[PDB]
Amino acid sequence: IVNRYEKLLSQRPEWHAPWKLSRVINGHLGWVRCVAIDPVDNEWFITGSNDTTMKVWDLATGKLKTTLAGHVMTVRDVAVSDRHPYLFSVSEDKTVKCWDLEKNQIIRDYYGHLSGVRTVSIHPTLDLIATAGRDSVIKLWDMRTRIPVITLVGHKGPINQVQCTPVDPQVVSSSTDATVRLWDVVAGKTMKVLTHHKRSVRATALHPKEFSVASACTDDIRSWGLAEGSLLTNFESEKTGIINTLSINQDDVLFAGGDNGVLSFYDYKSGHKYQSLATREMVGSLEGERSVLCSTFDKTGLRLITGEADKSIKIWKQPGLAWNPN
RNA sequence: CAGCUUUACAGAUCAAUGGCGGAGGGAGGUCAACAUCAAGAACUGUGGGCGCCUAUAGAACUUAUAACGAACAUGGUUC
C-alpha cells in the first residue's frame, strides 16, 4: 500500500558506524561453530568447534587462554552464565556438559537428549538451563539436580536456537519447521507460534535492552517483541545468503552472518541493512568454505566476534547506505 | 576454747527483710521426632552507639601431628 511506503520513506535510520576487520585468530583446527563471551567482564570469550575442543580467548591480546576437551563429537554451542561461574557447552555427542570455571573441569553432564544437541541457553535469572537438539524438543534442566525438569513438545522438527528471556515468554525456540515459538515453561505449553518465516529459521537472538528477538530463515530477518508475540520488523535481507548467525549489539546494530560469508549489518528495528562485508580466507583454503558460522558481540558492543569456517575467529572493530525500500 | 554463715530443733508476738516459690519427681531404654554438627580458629543472641564499634553476656558437642570415626568401604565424573 501507498500509506505505509510513504511513511517508511519519511522515517530515517540512525548512522551506525561501519565495521572493519581487526583481529583474526587462526587457532582452531576446525569450524569454530560456537562462540560466547562472559557477561560479567569481557576479558575472555570461548569458542566450541568441530575440533571437538573448545578454546578460550583473551579479547585484548587475542591470545589463546586455554583449551577444554570434554566432548567426543563436535561442539555445537556454548553458554557462559552471568549468575554462576559455569560454562555450559553442548555437542552432537548428545552431551550437555557443565564446566566449573573455578577449576576448568566438567561437573554435571546432563543426560536426556536422544540425539545431537544444537543449542543451550542459560536462563538469565533462574539456576536452570535450556537445551534443544535435533530431538525436536527443548528440555529445561534444574542445574542443581542435573535432570530435565520440563520439556516442550510443540515443535515438529529439529530445533536450533533456543533463547531464554526472564519474563513470561521464557523460551524462544526456532526450528527447521520455520516456526519460532514462544513458550510458558510453567504451563508446560506454547503461548504464541510465530510462523512468519518460509524456511528453517536457523538463527535467532534476543535484543539486550529492547525485549525483542531477531530471527532468520534463508533470507528474511524478522524481528519481534515477544510480549504479545507480535511482529516488529522485516529487515532488508533480500538476496543475502543463508543466514547462519544473527547476533544483536547493545547499540541496535544487528549483525547477520551468511553461508556466503557476507557479513551483513543492519540497524535494529529500522530493518535497514547498512553494510555488507566481503569475507576472507587463507591462501590454502577454498573460496566456497569462508562463511561466518557463529558470532556474537561483547557486552559493551564495539567488538563483533565471528567464528568462520576457515578455522578462524575474526573480531571486528568500527557514510551510511541509502534507504530505497521495495 | 571464742566468731559468723548453713542444716537438724522446740514453742513463740510474728512485723521486718531476704532467700527454695506461680513451689510436684528421679533413674534409666541397642526408643523415637526435630535442631545442629569443617568455619575469617571459625560460635550465638541482647540492647546501645549508629552493614560495622562498645558493653552485656552466655557456650552443649566436635578439633591440631587437625577433626564428628583414635574406624574405614563403595560409587560417579574428568585427566
- Measuring from the CA of residue A72 to each C1', which nucleotide is nearest? B78
Residue with cell 515459538: A181
State the method. Answer: cryo-EM
The residue type at A39: P
Task: Find the angle CA(A208)-CA(A212)-CA(A215) to the nearest 5 degrees.
Answer: 105
A251 is written with which cell numbers? Answer: 547499540
Helices (H), chain A: 2-10
Calculate the angstrom distance between C1' of B16 and CA of A59. Answer: 90
Q: What number of CA atoms fall less than 13 Å from residue A203's CA on the CB side?
A: 30
Please state whether A145 falls in left (phi above 0), alpha (psi between -120 and 50) or beta: alpha
How far from A55 is each of A29, A109, A304, CA to CA, in Å? 11, 19, 17
Three-class secondary structure of residue A7 per DSSP: helix
Query: Which residues are CB-contacts of A169 (< 8 A; sequence separation ≥ 6)?
Result: A182, A183, A184, A191, A192, A226, A227, A229
Neighbouring CB atoms inside 10 A of A230's CB total: 11
Q: How far is the CA of A96 from the C1' of B75 (A)?
A: 22
Scanning every strand, the nucleotide with its C1' closest to A105's CA turns out to be B78
Q: How far is CA A175 from CA A156, A181, A182, A274, in A?
A: 8, 8, 12, 28
Distance measured from the CA of protein residue A283 to the C1' of nucleotide B20, in angstroms = 102
Q: How many CB atoms neighbour CB A218 within 10 A?
A: 18
For residues A76 and A119, is the Cβ–Cβ distance under 8 A? yes
**Quick count: other Cβ atoms within 10 Å of Cβ A243?**
29
CA dist., res. A290 & res. A298, Å (int): 23
How far, in whole angstroms, is CA A5 from its chain's centroid? 31
Instruction: In whole angstroms, give the CA distance from residue A68 to residue A258.
Output: 28
Q: Residue A165, SS3?
A: coil
Architecture of domain A1-326: 7 Propeller (2.130)
**Closest CA relative to residue A204, chosen from A214, A193, A218, A217:** A214
Nearest partner of A307 among A63, A32, A118, judged by Cα: A32
What cell was used for A275? 553494510
Q: How far is CA A38 from CA A81, A97, A235, in A?
A: 7, 17, 29
Spatial strand order in the sheet of A180-184: A163-164, A171-172, A180-184, A189-194
Q: Would you mind telling me the total number of residues written for chain A in this entry? A: 326
Is residue A51 within 8 Å of residue A67, measured between CB atoms? no
Resolution of the experimental model, in Å, one decimal: 10.0
User: Coil, strand, or helix at residue A161?
Assistant: coil
Q: Please answer whether residues A119 and A162 qualify as being in contact, where contact means their C-beta atoms are separated by less than 8 angstroms.
A: yes
* Backbone dihedral angles phi then psi of residue A8, each to the nearest 5 degrees: -60, -45
Measured CA to CA, the distance from residue A3 to residue A10 in angstroms comes to 11
CA atoms within 13 A on the CB side of A272: 18
